[PDB]
Every structure is written in C-alpha cells, then in structure tokens.
C-alpha cells in the first residue's frame, strides 16, 4: 500500500500550489489597495491645483455595532436589528450601503453605532474575531482551507480574499458577508469617551453614524 | 447483593500523554546583571547582605560570594529575582569561576575543597575591592530600608 509518502506528496505539493496562488494574489491586492489610496490623494491634490474640488465617492461599506441592550425596544427597529443580525450588545456586522439598506440604518440609529471601517480594522476584525457559518455551527477561521471550502464557489480561497471581497464590496459581497458570523466585540477598553451613550454622536453621545471614528471605537472593542 | 453493580466498567488502561511542544530555551538575564556587579540579597538566609555576582549557572541561579572574610557570605547560589542589581561594580577578570557549576552544589559540615575555593576566589576580589575606598565597608554592612525610603524612586 502506497499513500505513505505517495498521496502525501500529491497533497503537500498541491497545498504548495495554493499557498503560491494566495501569496501571488495577496501581493496584487496590496498594490490595488495603495495605488487606489494614492490615486485619491493625488486627485485631491490635482483638483486643488486646477482650483477645483475633489469629492470622495460616498462610502459603499459600513460597519454597525449594536450599542443598546436587549429590552424595551419598539417592534419595527427590533426586527431590523434582527435582519441585520445584531441581536446582542456590542455585536457588529458589515452592511453594504444602498438606499434599501440606508433606510434600515435610519430606523435603528438610537440603538447602534456605525461608520466607515478602514482596511486596518477589517483586517484586524477578521484575523482576531472572524468566524464562519458552516451548517450553522460558527466555526473559527484559523486556516484558509475553511474559507475556500465554503467560499471557493465565488473565488475567495484565503482569509485575505474574504477581507478583499468585503472592503471592495465585491460582486459576491452578499455571500461573503453572510458567511461571516456576527462579530462579538467586548466593551471598549478606553471607555466610550462620552458620559451618556444614548444620544447621537453629534450630540455628544455614542449612537448613529460617527463616520471614520468607528475605527477607534471598534479597535478598542476588538 | 447490597448494590447491583454496573453494566459498564471504566477501562483501567492509562493512556499516553500527547506529545507536548515546549522547548526549554535559555534565560536571558536583565542587562543590569553582569559579573562583578554588587547585589543586594532581598530574601533568605543572607537577606540584606551586599554581595558580588560571579557566574550564571545552568540552573538559572546566580553565583555570588561575599567575599566571605568581609560580610561572612560564602560562594553560594542565589535566585536572580530575589536580588537587587546595583550600579557599583568590580572587575572579575582575575577570578577563575570556571570550576563552579550545578553539580558542585549537589547536596551529596564544610568540605575542605570549599574552604579552599573560598580563599582563591575571595583573594582575587579583595585585591580588586581595596582599589576603590570604602567599598569593603559597604560590603560588610547590611542594607535596610530607612524611613522615607521609596524603592520605586531610589537609584541603586
């Protein structure tokens, strides 16, 4: 009987081909990320040269964390919370922005906090707290083979493929994002920076869209 | 019977431990602990005695001597976490120290090898101590926290 080193070296070799593919991909993404990031920087500078104004395309991706406890919630916001999978306090998810999800975010503003996540906080959300849904069962993503197993259908064979398909709002974002179990964050470590959570951010509380400030919060909760 | 007895008994076969992965890597002492440095012993028999640091033994402990004829403290093992490394230092270039290892301290009154090793090491040190005045008396006197001493403040 073979397979001793036989299909060991058929697999281990096949596993090198994939890590090869992943390495090759994650290198391109990094080029994508920073060239896209520099193009914007230089666009804001070119527009100021010509005397004009460059306006950033409004964000297509949003990260929502439920700020409010379980009880005394009116029914209509309470279902939206469920349909966004925030059923527990400090549990976040990603939501792609369209009018049809924008109205949802409107309904739940007093119970959540959300804003525009940076590549950094998405990377550090998935690496530390990312879990998949496989026959329900909430499996941790500790090896790229779990992801390819259930997301390979769409592309997406690596943990970073996931991360890419998320931040870019891919064609498959729905399947990519629903695959991720809702992130369960801890309470912030530096506290909330506010004396009362349940006013709006603008009002000196924590709720509603705080834009890029969602990162310092989420990082203290991750 | 008084009790029926089970339908199932545990296997009395005791299993094997999983193959653990913990390498024993070496202890890197803090930069303040360098041979020739004077130490303050914080605990044990010789607590509060000021003493000279010689060699770092394979069991992680430090090798010190008093010198014996100064403060009464012999060639001895001491734990690097019960000691205060001071700034004041003497050169150990003229002390041998190679002879001294863990086995040398196996339990297995004083053996004459020790009384002699104590004299060869201490004579080298005292040769050096006398170079810097009052260093000998410093080593003969015990350390104590006085009133108003704030360890988290004091330089050593």
């Amino acid at each position: 009987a073979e397979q001793v080193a036989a299909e060991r070296a058929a697999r281990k070799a096949a596993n090198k081909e994939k890590r090869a593919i992943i390495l090759e991909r994650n290198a391109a993404y990094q080029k994508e990320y920073e060239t896209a990031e520099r193009n914007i920087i230089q666009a804001k500078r070119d527009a100021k040269a010509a005397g004009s104004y460059y306006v950033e395309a409004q964000h297509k991706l949003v990260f929502v964390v439920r700020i409010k406890g379980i009880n005394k919630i009116p029914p209509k916001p309470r279902k939206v919370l469920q349909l966004l999978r925030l059923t527990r306090i400090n549990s976040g998810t990603f939501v792609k922005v369209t009018k049809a999800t924008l109205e949802l975010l409107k309904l739940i503003e007093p119970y959540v906090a959300y804003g525009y996540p940076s590549y950094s906080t998405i990377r550090q959300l998935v690496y530390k707290r990312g879990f998949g849904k496989i026959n329900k069962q909430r499996v941790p993503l500790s090896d790229n083979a779990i992801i390819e197993a259930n997301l390979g259908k769409y592309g997406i064979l690596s943990i970073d493929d996931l991360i890419h398909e998320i931040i870019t709002v891919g064609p498959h974002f729905k399947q990519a994002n629903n695959f991720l179990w809702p992130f369960k964050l801890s309470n912030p470590s530096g506290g909330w920076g506010v004396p009362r959570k349940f006013k709006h951010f603008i009002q000196g509380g924590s709720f509603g869209n705080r834009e890029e400030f969602i990162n310092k919060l989420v990082k203290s909760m991750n | 019977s008084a009790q029926k007895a089970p339908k199932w008994y545990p296997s009395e076969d005791v299993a094997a431990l999983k193959k653990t992965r913990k390498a024993a890597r070496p202890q890197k002492l803090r930069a303040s602990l360098v041979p020739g440095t004077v130490l303050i012993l914080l605990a044990g028999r010789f607590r509060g005695k000021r003493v000279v640091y010689l060699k770092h033994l394979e069991d992680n402990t430090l090798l010190i001597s008093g010198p014996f004829k100064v403060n009464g403290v012999p060639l001895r093992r001491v734990n690097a976490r019960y000691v205060i490394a001071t700034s004041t230092k003497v050169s150990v270039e003229g002390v041998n120290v190679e002879k001294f290892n863990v086995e040398y301290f196996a339990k297995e009154e004083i053996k004459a090898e020790r009384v002699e090793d104590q004299k060869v090491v201490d004579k080298a040190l005292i040769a050096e101590i006398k170079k810097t005045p009052l260093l000998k008396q410093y080593l003969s006197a015990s350390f104590s926290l006085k009133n108003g001493d704030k360890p988290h403040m004091l330089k050593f």
Partner: protein, 51 residues
C-alpha cells in the same frame, strides 16, 4: 481546541497569508511615498482664508 490570534502569533499569521513574509522583509508598512510638488491655486487659498 484553542483559537490562536494571528495578530499576535507569528506562526499562525504565516499559516494564513504567506505574503506576510514579503511584507515584513520589504517593510511596506512604512513605505515612503512619491515626493511631488503640486501647490493649490489661488482660489482655494483665498476662499480658505476668507470669512
């Protein structure tokens, strides 16, 4: 049995993401940016300091 956090476990960091090695070897978290000299037109500067 026990989840290991890639963000502090260099082993697990590398089991995912082989590109981590290249990244660190090439710095790349500190990548120094193209030094270019554009300056803003007067309009931008005038209306910025306007009232």
């Amino acid at each position: 049995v026990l989840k290991k956090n890639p963000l502090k476990n260099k082993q697990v960091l590398l089991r995912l993401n082989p590109y981590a090695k290249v990244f660190a070897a090439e710095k790349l978290g500190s990548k120094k940016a193209e030094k270019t000299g554009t300056k803003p037109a007067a309009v931008f500067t005038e209306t910025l300091k306007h009232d």
